Design a protein around this ligand. Structure first.
Ligand SMILES: CCCCCCCCCCCCCCCCCC(=O)OC[C@H](COP(=O)(O)OCCN)OC(=O)CCCCCCCCCCCCCCCCC
Ligand SMILES: CC(C)CCC[C@@H](C)[C@H]1CC[C@H]2[C@@H]3CC=C4C[C@@H](OC(=O)CCC(=O)O)CC[C@]4(C)[C@H]3CC[C@@]12C
Ligand SMILES: CC(C)CCC[C@@H](C)[C@H]1CC[C@H]2[C@@H]3CC=C4C[C@@H](OC(=O)CCC(=O)O)CC[C@]4(C)[C@H]3CC[C@]12C
Ligand SMILES: CC(C)CCC[C@@H](C)[C@H]1CC[C@H]2[C@@H]3CC=C4C[C@@H](OC(=O)CCC(=O)O)CC[C@]4(C)[C@H]3CC[C@]12C
Ligand SMILES: CC(C)CCC[C@@H](C)[C@H]1CC[C@H]2[C@@H]3CC=C4C[C@@H](OC(=O)CCC(=O)O)CC[C@]4(C)[C@H]3CC[C@]12C
Ligand SMILES: CC(C)CCC[C@@H](C)[C@H]1CC[C@H]2[C@@H]3CC=C4C[C@@H](OC(=O)CCC(=O)O)CC[C@]4(C)[C@H]3CC[C@]12C
Ligand SMILES: CC(C)CCC[C@@H](C)[C@H]1CC[C@H]2[C@@H]3CC=C4C[C@@H](OC(=O)CCC(=O)O)CC[C@]4(C)[C@H]3CC[C@]12C
Ligand SMILES: CC(C)CCC[C@@H](C)[C@H]1CC[C@H]2[C@@H]3CC=C4C[C@@H](OC(=O)CCC(=O)O)CC[C@]4(C)[C@H]3CC[C@]12C
Ligand SMILES: O=c1[nH]c2ccccc2n1C1CCN(CCCC(c2ccc(F)cc2)c2ccc(F)cc2)CC1
Ligand SMILES: CC(=O)N[C@@H]1[C@@H](O)[C@H](O)[C@@H](CO)O[C@H]1O
Ligand SMILES: *[C@@H]1O[C@H](CO)[C@@H](O)[C@H](O)[C@H]1NC(C)=O
Ligand SMILES: [Ca+2]
Ligand SMILES: [Ca+2]
Length: 1135
């Protein structure tokens, strides 16, 4: 109409969208200036003027809303409320309206002011690339419901188990005697806490509960052993971590299960449970990690990638002067280019040399070397501008880059006064970048990287919007609430606080990286209220398991003589290895020399070596070593076996030379190390593992380019880190650690000059620290040491140099992107391979698939026995009583049962327990009722043919057994061990599995997993084998690292040490998960007090290599498991 026609021109003007986006950004800026720790009551100039800007923004929002409705109409597909984000704009408009109205009413209500945080979210529709990406993501969400209901299963089952088992156990610290006698001066705390004010508790075990720590393992204080008086322990006070980790409710159990889903702070709470209740809870925690933490979130990645692929396909288908030439010859000589390559390589080698307290002569050598190299590069500059000419030089901008290097280098040489020495040295790294102009494959690889970034840009902008929104929200609800109490006289804020928007963003990024996010969780959820964990859950989930899987999907979709017998020899030699491996699983460095076990191990090694050399001889006489083709050494695995047997012979010969053991000890160490590799012949002597290892190696080459690029970035950033930090990572750890500046002041107080173990002195330690950063573990501590570092030899101060965040976050982001593109590379390769075959086999299956269609045509009607069940008092059971309306009843009763076990908690009112008992009776009776109905519906033919009614039978049998045993303790007929009742309550959870019948989508998803078990099982066997090899190596290497008070460990706490074999197999399982593995490495490389040669040994050279190789191999094996599942998923989606 005419009134609409007045404003359609303005509202449809792209200028209107431009000014809209501009006011969105200005609103974001006004939000950013919030200072919760400083902005109390808004009694300042900045506060009032920002309130004025927010008023203006609200005015503009109301104006744009009203014009858009009057010009587009209301409540219709073409009207204003047609598109989602128009409705969202409506929502924030009304929210601001009510906020302003309540502000007029003089009501503070800092619970609706927090709604402002949704305002930046309006920009999502004002950028078309963002619009289309978010539209696709929203459209691909609704197919994600299946994995989320799987999430509900694997949270609810374990939460019920936990609340039934460990309810309230966490509380029970260790108290004093009942009628205790003290002369006076009451300093004895009510219970015992080893560290001040209960951040590390001493959870005991009640009498009657078989815990492991039972209040007689307390440390004797070091006079008067006051601690020994802590005799008995009863419940009370608070659960551990400021009342944040417990299993009392089911909400708390869900919080804890979420924490161990993120694989952070895991062994801490596992050891709480072990302290309190039983030693056998590692089964509970490991079964959760394997299922809940790996087969769950990676199923989310698989489902998101697959569904996004098909939604992209769907939307796509919807559309459906003379010597110049002479000198030119020397330039492209194919020998001069390699000469300047060698020049640049030795230049970067020279650059990496410098370190802390470098030799006085060496720095002069380096500076003259720099002069030589810049002179050579300038010579190349002049010769190339001469033989080519000014225009020919500028034709390729790589020449421009080289000229830039030349000019900055000569400027650095000239700039010897000030300023230049601080920065122009730091630009020397660009000289390394000249290699790309030479190496060919590293041109196409970077080109395809840029092709990816072409689309990754919009996702990156989306990510920063998301992180900004959540940082604003956190800074609201947690603002100035993390004030850590006094420690040296003042309440120093936690470094992870939310007080300033800079710290808000860096803390939200920290949490997104899942490193020390539990510290923030506890320190926040004990500040506001226990419901504050929903914020962390929403952040971590919506970010990590949705947006990032979206990024992965974006990349993946973007890239589109004598007699010889060989009948059963392999199985028997595999048996012999099993035996050898259980001979290898016992050499703990604690068996006393000359014991029965030592002798048994020696003789077992003797016979096993005899058997293996015998089979080696058999094979070689069958084939021959290298005498022509098809010999013994024409295959890799035979070469490996020969290598192992040769090392075995060397070891036995040297061992028999034990006399004169001086100077050969290192040889013995190396020979033991190479012994531990012997459990690797299974791959050769088993077909599936052999094929899988070949497939791994084959998939390893197409990602080689990215690996080399990532290693180059590691070297570049390592040299950069050496440049920035030289010897700044020294801090005066003492009783005061205050009012002291430099080493001289520290020695004045005589405390100590402690040296951090993760530093940037050398380039090797630079690479170690960079690997720690890149693996998202313990990187916050390194970042704190980086920001705090002040100068060469004095105390770091808190946040001295907040600019290093750029380095410490840019490294994480770049390394993370390279790792993501490495995965995406594995998938593409594998798909290409299978797709090439696939169709061939599947064609024949489709020829058989129509036969299966013909098979169902046979199935039409074999006179089903409904009539025999008709008129026999059950004409209604078989037909009217087996309808879906009778199964909605069963599902509803299942949900009521779920929500009624979801109500148990510690110290519940007795009335609630009685009501739950009555509800259990109700539900058992009804389950019996439809069990009998189903049994009368049909005889025993289909009763054993359903394969699912048996599940109902088992459940009803468990339920009736449970209700029957309840009577036994009503009448006290027989003394029943409460363990039986425990098992029965905890097993009542089996009534949940009845939902699987209706959830056909979950059935399909779990199936798609199930027909991946060839590859998945072979990879799992490989993974166990890798743990075995690395555990044996670790036991041999770090076996004797004593952990006591005088050697305070950081990561190997109680059973995570390497002493035994299994105790090391656990710590390998812990390192693989990436929880406090950096702590374990710091524990190993630890100079001791000359108590042992292991501490003084070559640990520094070999411990980091051990840990890095293990972490890389474990992660790669897991990636290959995931890609196998994903390919089978795409194949199933094809059919
Ligand atoms: C037999 C199998 C042979 C396997 C060869 C190993 C080379 C292939 C590397 C695979 C990629 C590693 C990876 O994806 O680890 C990611 C993982 C993330 O950690 P988190 O966030 O806690 O879960 O943990 C990490 O972040 C690890 C840090 C990634 C750094 C990649 C460096 C690659 C260069 C290695 C060259 C060889 C070094 C010896
Ligand atoms: C390549 C990326 C993917 C991972 C980085 C691998 C590093 C963990 C490796 C390669 C460089 C090695 C470093 C080379 C040099 C050294 C110096 C070495 O000797 C020392 O300077 C400390 C002892 C001393 O001399 O006082 C300590 C081991 C270390 C850090 C090495 C740590 C382990 C390192 C093997
Ligand atoms: C192109 C579109 C899609 C980008 C959307 C993201 C922006 C809306 C976000 C990303 C970066 C944010 C900026 C990050 C940094 C700050 C600095 C901040 O100022 C302060 O740091 C003050 C700190 C203090 O006072 O203690 C003001 C908000 C602002 C500009 C933010 C405004 C909102 C920005 C631009
Ligand atoms: C998610 C599905 C696929 C598997 C569910 C596994 C857990 C719910 C069950 C399986 C084995 C049970 C464990 C079997 C043995 C015990 C010993 C038991 O010790 C005492 O009661 C004393 C403590 C419970 C626990 C760990 C159980 C915890 C709960 C577990 C891990
Ligand atoms: C996408 C949805 C499902 C999650 C998005 C996160 C927020 C919209 C929700 C989830 C967590 C909730 C918070 C949980 C904890 C806090 C602190 C909590 O502390 C108090 O009791 C202070 C009471 C007061 O004086 O306001 C009050 C509820 C609140 C603000 C909640 C506000 C709304 C939050 C941030
Ligand atoms: C891959 C190439 C281009 C980079 C250089 C290799 C580095 C990994 C290695 C080779 C030489 C090593 C340096 C050799 C000499 C020193 C001094 C040395 O101090 C001693 O007194 C011993 C400490 C190790 C360090 C810094 C080493 C640091 C690690 C370096 C640079
Ligand atoms: C079957 C093959 C293919 C590999 C299986 C080997 C391991 C999975 C098993 C078999 C031998 C078991 C080990 C047998 C003996 C020991 C020593 C044992 O040490 C002690 O308990 C001594 C301390 C004490 O007695 O109090 C710890 C368990 C452990 C490591 C066992 C851990 C689990 C092991 C390594
Ligand atoms: C690859 C996944 C399935 C990890 C499997 C874990 C168990 C095989 C490991 C981890 C915990 C280890 C236990 C940790 C503690 C002890 C006590 C300790 O003896 C004292 C050594 C044996 C034992 C039972 C270990 C036996 C082997 C265990 C159960
Ligand atoms: O959550 C995050 N925020 C972050 C912010 C910055 C940097 C990293 C961030 N992270 C990661 C943290 C852990 N987690 C999976 C790790 C690797 C994972 C993977 C690797 C590559 C890839 F392309 C997709 C998924 C994977 C999955 C299965 C495996 F078997 C091995 C490894 C999700 C991403
Ligand atoms: C060391 C200690 O506990 N407190 C010191 C105090 O003695 C000293 O006077 C003050 C100024 O330097 O710094 C603080
Ligand atoms: C070390 O700190 C003290 C304490 O103020 C100061 O006087 C001195 O100049 C500093 N530098 C030294 C001793 O080189
Ligand atoms: Ca950690
Ligand atoms: Ca981690």
């Amino acid at each position: 109409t005419s009134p609409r026609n007045w404003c359609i021109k303005m509202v449809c003007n792209p200028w209107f969208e431009c000014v809209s986006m501009l006011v969105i950004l200005l609103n974001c800026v006004t939000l950013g200036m919030y200072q919760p720790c400083d902005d109390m009551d808004c009694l300042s100039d900045r506060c009032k003027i920002l309130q004025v800007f927010d008023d203006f923004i609200f005015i503009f929002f109301a104006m744009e809303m009203v014009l858009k409705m009057v010009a587009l109409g209301i409540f219709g597909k073409k009207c204003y409320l047609g598109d989602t984000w128009n409705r969202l704009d409506f929502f924030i408009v009304m929210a601001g309206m009510v906020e302003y109205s309540l502000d007029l009413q003089n009501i503070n209500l800092s619970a609706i002011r927090t709604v402002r945080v949704l305002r930046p979210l309006k920009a999502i529709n004002r950028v078309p690339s963002m619009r289309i990406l978010v539209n696709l993501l929203l459209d691909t969400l609704p197919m994600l419901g299946n994995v989320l209901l799987l999430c509900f299963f694997v949270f609810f089952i374990f939460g019920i188990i936990g609340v039934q088992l460990w309810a309230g156990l966490l509380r029970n610290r260790c108290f004093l005697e009942e009628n205790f006698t003290i002369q006076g001066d009451v300093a004895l705390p009510p219970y015992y806490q080893p560290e001040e004010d209960d951040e590390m508790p001493f959870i005991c075990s009640l009498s009657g509960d078989n815990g492991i720590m039972g209040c007689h393992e307390i440390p004797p204080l070091k006079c008067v052993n006051w601690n020994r008086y802590y005799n008995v322990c009863r419940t009370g006070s608070a659960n551990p971590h400021k009342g944040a980790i417990n299993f009392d409710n089911i909400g708390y159990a869900w919080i804890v299960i979420f924490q161990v889903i993120t694989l952070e702070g895991w062994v801490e709470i596992m050891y709480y449970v072990m302290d309190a209740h039983s030693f056998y809870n590692f089964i509970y925690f490991i079964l959760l990690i394997i299922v809940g933490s790996f087969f769950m979130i990676n199923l989310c990645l698989v489902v998101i990638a697959t569904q996004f692929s098909e939604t992209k396909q769907r939307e796509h288908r919807l559309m459906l002067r003379e010597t110049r030439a002479k000198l030119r010859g020397i330039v492209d000589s194919k020998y001069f280019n390699r000469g300047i390559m060698m020049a640049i390589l030795v230049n970067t080698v020279s650059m990496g040399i410098e370190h802390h307290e470098q030799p006085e002569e060496l720095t002069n050598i380096l500076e003259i070397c720099n002069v030589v190299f810049t002179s050579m590069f300038a010579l190349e500059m002049i010769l190339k501008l001469a033989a080519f000419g000014l225009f020919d030089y500028l034709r390729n901008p790589y020449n421009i880059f080289d000229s830039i290097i030349v000019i900055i280098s000569i400027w650095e040489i000239v700039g010897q006064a000030d300023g230049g020495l601080s920065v122009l040295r730091t630009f020397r790294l660009l000289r390394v970048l000249k290699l790309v102009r030479f190496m060919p494959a590293l041109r196409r690889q970077l080109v395809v990287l840029m092709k990816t970034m072409d689309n990754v840009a919009t996702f990156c902008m989306l990510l920063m919007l998301f992180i900004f929104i959540f940082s604003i929200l956190g800074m609201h609800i947690f603002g100035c609430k993390f004030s850590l109490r006094t420690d040296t006289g003042d309440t120093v804020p936690d470094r992870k606080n939310f007080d300033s928007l800079l710290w808000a963003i860096v803390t939200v990024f920290q949490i997104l990286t899942q490193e020390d996010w539990n510290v923030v969780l506890y320190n926040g959820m004990a500040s506001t209220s226990p419901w504050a964990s929903l914020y962390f859950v929403a952040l971590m989930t919506f970010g990590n398991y949705v947006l990032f899987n979206l990024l992965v999907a974006i990349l993946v979709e973007g890239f589109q003589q004598t007699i010889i017998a060989h009948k059963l020899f392999d199985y028997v030699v595999l048996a012999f290895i099993f035996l050898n491996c259980i001979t290898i699983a016992l050499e703990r460095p604690q068996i006393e020399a000359g014991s029965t076990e030592r002798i048994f191990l020696t003789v077992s090694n003797y016979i096993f070596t005899a058997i293996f050399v015998g089979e080696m001889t058999l094979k070689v006489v069958s084939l021959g070593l290298y005498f022509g083709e098809q010999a013994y050494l024409r295959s890799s695995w035979n070469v490996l076996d020969g290598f192992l047997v040769f090392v075995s012979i060397i070891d036995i010969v040297v061992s028999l030379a034990s006399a004169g053991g001086a100077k050969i000890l290192g040889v013995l160490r190396v020979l033991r190390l190479l012994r531990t590799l012997r459990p690797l012949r299974v791959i050769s002597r088993a077909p599936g593992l052999k094929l899988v290892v070949e497939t791994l190696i084959s998939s390893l080459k197409p990602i080689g380019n990215i690996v080399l690029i990532c290693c180059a970035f590691f070297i570049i950033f390592g040299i950069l880190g050496v440049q920035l930090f030289k010897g700044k990572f020294y801090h005066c750890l003492g009783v005061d650690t205050r009012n002291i500046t430099n080493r001289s002041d520290c020695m004045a107080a005589n405390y100590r000059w402690v040296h951090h173990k993760y530093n940037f002195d050398n380039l090797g330690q630079a690479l170690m620290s960079l690997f720690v950063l890149a693996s998202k573990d313990g990187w916050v501590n390194i970042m704190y040491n980086g920001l705090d570092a002040v100068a060469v030899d004095q105390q770091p101060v808190t946040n001295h140099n907040p600019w290093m965040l750029l380095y410490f976050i840019s490294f994480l982001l770049i390394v993370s992107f390279f790792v993501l593109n490495m995965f995406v590379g594995v998938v593409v390769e594998n798909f290409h391979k299978c797709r090439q075959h696939q169709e061939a086999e599947e064609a024949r299956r489709r020829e058989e698939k129509r036969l299966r269609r013909l098979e169902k045509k046979r199935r039409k009607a074999q006179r089903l026995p409904y009539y025999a069940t008709y008129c026999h008092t059950r004409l209604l059971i078989h037909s009217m009583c087996t309808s879906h309306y009778l199964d909605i009843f069963i599902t509803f009763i299942i949900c009521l049962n779920v929500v009624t076990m979801s109500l148990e908690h510690y110290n519940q009112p007795t009335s609630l327990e009685t009501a739950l008992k009555y509800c259990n009776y109700m539900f058992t009776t009804v389950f019996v009722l439809e069990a009998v109905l189903k049994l009368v519906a049909f005889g025993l033919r289909r009763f054993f043919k359903d394969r699912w009614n048996q599940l109902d039978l088992a459940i009803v049998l468990l339920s009736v057994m449970g209700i029957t045993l309840e009577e036994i303790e009503i009448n006290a007929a027989l003394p029943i061990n409460p363990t039986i009742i425990r098992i029965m309550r905890v097993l009542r959870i089996a009534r949940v599995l009845k939902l699987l019948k209706m959830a056909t989508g979950m059935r399909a998803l779990l199936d798609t997993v199930v027909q991946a078990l060839p590859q998945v099982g072979n990879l799992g066997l490989l993974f166990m084998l890798l743990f075995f090899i690395y555990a044996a190596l670790g036991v041999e290497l770090f076996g004797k690292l004593v952990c006591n008070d005088e050697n305070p460990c950081e990561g190997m706490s109680r059973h995570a040490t390497f002493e035994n074999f299994g105790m090391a197999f656990l710590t390998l399982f812990q390192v693989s998960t990436g929880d406090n593995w950096n702590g374990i490495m710091k524990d190993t490389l630890r100079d001791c007090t000359h108590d042992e040669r292991s501490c003084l040994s070559s640990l520094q050279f070999v411990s980091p290599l051990y840990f890095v190789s293990f972490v890389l191999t474990a992660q790669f094996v897991l990636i290959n498991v995931v890609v196998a599942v994903l390919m089978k998923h795409l194949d199933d989606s094809n059919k």
